[PDB]
Amino acid sequence: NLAQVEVQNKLSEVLSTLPATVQQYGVTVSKARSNFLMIVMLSSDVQSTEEMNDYAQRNVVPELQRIEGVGQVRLFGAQRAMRIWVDPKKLQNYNLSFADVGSALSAQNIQISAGSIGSLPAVRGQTVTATVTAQGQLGTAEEFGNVILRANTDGSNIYLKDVAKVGLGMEDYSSSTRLNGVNTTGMAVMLSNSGNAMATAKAVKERLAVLEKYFPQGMSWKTPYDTSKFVEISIEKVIHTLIEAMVLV
C-alpha cells in the first residue's frame, strides 16, 4: 500500500508532460499476478460475439472485480463503439478532409445544460420554478449519418453518409477467443498478492450462479479452466493417506 502511494505520487508529477493522446486515454496502475486463475466463457446461440462482449463488459465484469481477492479481470474483446469508415476517394470529389469530419462530429454531438426558469436570486412576486432541458446529442446510426459537413448556398447539403459508412462496432479489434473451435466470449481472472485461490474460485462461482438469473434469453456460462481442483484433490488425498497411516500404526 505504501509502495503504491509513493508510485502514485511519483507518477502525478509527469502526467502533464506525456503526449496528448496518452493523457486522453489515461495511465493505470495495478498490483496483481500475471498467471490466470481461471477463464469463464459465455457461449450462446442467438447473439454474436460483439453483443456478448458488450453484455459481459456492462453486467458481468464489474460484479466479478469487487470480489474479495480478485486482482484483475481481463476481457478478450472490447465493448461497443460507433465506428466511422471514411473513403478517401470521396473526400476529393467534394474537397473535404479528415479534420473537417472530426470538427463536424465534435461540433454537433455536444451536451447542453440549460438551467432553470425563475432562478434563485429572483424578483419579488415569483410563484413557480421549472427546469429546462434540451438534448442536442446523437444516439443512433441514422442520426450520425445525417451530420452536415458543408452547407453551401445551393441548398444541397453534404451529409456524413455521403463520404463514409457508419455503424456500431467494437472499439478494439485486437484479441479473440475460441472454445473447442467455436467462437465464445472469455475473460481471464488473475489473483492478487496475498489472496487465496480456493476461496476466490468458490466466491467467483457462487456469484456467477447468482448472476445467471438475469442472463438474456439464450446464453449460458461455464468455467473449463480452473486451477483450484488440483489443490482440492491433493488435500483430499493427503488426508486419506493420514487416515491410513494412523490405522496402520
Binding site: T21, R58, R80, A81, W85, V86, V101
Partner: peptide, 19 residues
Amino acid sequence: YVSDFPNQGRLQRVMVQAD
C-alpha cells in the same frame, strides 16, 4: 477518438478511421 454518445444508459466512444 473524437467524442462520446449515449448508447442505452452509457457514454461510449466515437472513432474515425479510413476504409
